[PDB]
Amino acid sequence: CVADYSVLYNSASFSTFKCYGVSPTKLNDLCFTNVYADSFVIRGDEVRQI
Amino acid sequence: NLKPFERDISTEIYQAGSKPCNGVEGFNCYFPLQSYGFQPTNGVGYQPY
């Protein structure tokens, strides 16, 4: 599938958006064999532990 | 990226998204200089050279 990370990242609703292998601007053209989204609920105090 | 032997004193705010940042702070814009936390408890490689 084709992943529009520019629609995703420039949204205002995220209180945290942080990336570790890449600067986020690469995602618009960089390619991968698969992607996993791992999704869950925690306290706002604990978002740092992720 | 800067050219060979260019120097850059600029302190004006960087923009990291499609939306403007006509001000001092934001979610997608930043002050462009960051300090080194040079503590003596740092391991080698994280020490000042």
Swiss-Prot record, chain B:
Outcome when changing N42Y: In strain: Alpha/B.1.1.7, Beta/B.1.351, Gamma/P.1, Theta/P.3, Mu/B.1.621, 19B/501Y, Omicron/BA.1, Omicron/BA.2, Omicron/BA.2.12.1, Omicron/BA.2.75, Omicron/BA.4, Omicron/BA.5, Omicron/BQ.1.1, Omicron/XBB.1.5, Omicron/EG.5.1; May enhance affinity to human ACE2 receptor
Annotated stretches, region: Receptor-binding motif: 1-49
Effect of Q39R: In strain: Omicron/BA.1, Omicron/BA.2, Omicron/BA.2.12.1, Omicron/BA.2.75, Omicron/BA.4, Omicron/BA.5, Omicron/BQ.1.1, Omicron/XBB.1.5, Omicron/EG.5.1
Known outcome of mutating N42T: In strain: 19B/501T
Effect of F31L: Increased resistance to neutralizing antibodies and human covalescent sera neutralization
Effect of E25K: In strain: Beta/B.1.351, Eta/B.1.525, Theta/P.3, Iota/B.1.526, B.1.1.318, Gamma/P.1, Zeta/P.2 and Mu/B.1.621; May enhance affinity to human ACE2 receptor
Cysteine disulfide partners in this protein: C21-C29
Effect in UniProt of substituting N1K: In strain: Omicron/BA.2.75, Omicron/BQ.1.1, Omicron/XBB.1.5, Omicron/EG.5.1
Cited function: Attaches the virion to the cell membrane by interacting with host receptor, initiating the infection. The major receptor is host ACE2. When S2/S2' has been cleaved, binding to the receptor triggers direct fusion at the cell membrane. When S2/S2' has not been cleaved, binding to the receptor results in internalization of the virus by endocytosis using host TFRC and GRM2 and leading to fusion of the virion membrane with the host endosomal membrane. Alternatively, may use NRP1/NRP2 and integrin as entry receptors.
Assembly and oligomerization: Binds to host ACE2. RBD also interacts with the N-linked glycan on 'Asn-90' of ACE2. Cleavage of S generates a polybasic C-terminal sequence on S1 that binds to host Neuropilin-1 (NRP1) and Neuropilin-2 (NRP2) receptors. Interacts with host integrin alpha-5/beta-1 (ITGA5:ITGB1) and with ACE2 in complex with integrin alpha-5/beta-1 (ITGA5:ITGB1). May interact via cytoplasmic c-terminus with M protein. May interact (via N-terminus) with host bilirubin and biliverdin, thereby preventing antibody binding to the SARS-CoV-2 spike NTD via an allosteric mechanism.
Protein name: Spike protein S1
